[PDB]
Specification:
This protein is of the alpha+beta class. It has two domains: 92 residues, Phosphorylase Kinase, domain 1, CATH 3.30.200.20; 181 residues, Transferase(Phosphotransferase) domain 1 (Transferase(Phosphotransferase), domain 1), CATH 1.10.510.10. It has nine helices and twelve strands. Strands 1-2-3-7-6 form a five-stranded antiparallel β-sheet, with helices on one face. The protein has a three-stranded antiparallel β-sheet with strand order 8-10-11. α3 runs antiparallel to α5 and α5 packs antiparallel against α7. Belongs to the protein kinase superfamily. CAMK Ser/Thr protein kinase family. PIM subfamily. Its EC number is 2.7.11.1.
Length: 273
């Protein structure tokens, strides 16, 4: 059955992704999130090896849900006549990073460093599994407030990773790179890195660096908050206008600002508990 297995609780929210509810698995009381997507709202379709037309997000979530990681895992999914329903892990207690930054303002560099490292690890894991997320942003990251662990959500704008050009983008504009705004073309990794620079800026300044198309393609970064020279240098590198001037994940993680990261548990103790 569909909803004998899961006890549905309140609506967590809704939007372009569909509608997400809090829930419990009856057989063991595991916290779950239950996401409902209308078939008419799905542009990206895939198929499972067994031959079933599933949304691309299910295909992508299956590729990244083996083993432990900083991605929210797909536990199960159901097809209904007009919709699909995804059963996903749910940290408890949990707050999304957008909501967290709105509440606390700019994050201390120590906390931004831990958070940003964990996002890098999660994106690297996705990339190793053949998956490009394509909508990396604060609203798509959940913080397990007790464990200090960050978790990626929402692969509904994602794609299989390839080495050829993407001419489609359906993620968040203000996190979209200047080469997409100008040419409607990007490559996966270098665009991921740009969105990562938007995130890091967001973390340490408390808001995104660019509002309009024109500021994105001018790509000049003004700091409104006191930020360290090393942190400003990493941001500016991630947000280089030419894709080929951007760092690899390795170069980011080997950056001087990224040295001596707190563990998730220490992060929760110092900063979240």
């Amino acid at each position: 059955p569909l909803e004998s297995q899961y006890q549905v609780g309140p609506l967590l929210g809704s939007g372009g992704f569909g509608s997400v509810y809090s829930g419990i698995r009856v057989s063991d009381n595991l916290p779950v999130a239950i996401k409902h997507v209308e078939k008419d709202r799905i542009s990206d379709w895939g198929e499972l090896p067994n031959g079933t037309r599933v949304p691309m997000e299910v295909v992508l979530l299956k590729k990244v849900s083996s083993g432990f990681s900083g991605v929210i895992r797909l536990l199960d999914w159901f097809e209904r006549p007009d919709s699909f329903v995804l059963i996903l892990e749910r940290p408890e207690p949990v707050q999304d990073l957008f909501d967290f930054i709105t509440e606390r303002g700019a994050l201390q560099e120590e906390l931004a460093r831990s958070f940003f490292w964990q996002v890098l690890e999660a994106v690297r894991h996705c990339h190793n599994c053949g998956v490009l997320h394509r909508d990396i942003k604060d609203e798509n990251i959940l913080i397990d407030l007790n464990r200090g662990e960050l978790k990626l959500i929402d692969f509904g704008s994602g794609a299989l990773l390839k080495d050829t050009v993407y001419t489609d983008f359906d993620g968040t504009r203000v996190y979209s790179p200047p080469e997409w705004i100008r040419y409607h073309r990007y490559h996966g990794r270098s665009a991921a890195v740009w969105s990562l620079g938007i995130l890091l800026y967001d973390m340490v300044c408390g808001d995104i660096p660019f509002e309009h198309d024109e500021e994105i393609i001018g790509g000049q970064v003004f700091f409104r908050q006191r930020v360290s020279s090393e942190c400003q240098h990493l941001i500016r590198w991630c947000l280089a206008l030419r894709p080929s001037d951007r760092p690899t994940f390795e170069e980011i993680q080997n950056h001087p600002w990224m040295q001596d990261v707190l563990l998730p548990q220490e992060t929760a103790e110092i900063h979240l508990h």
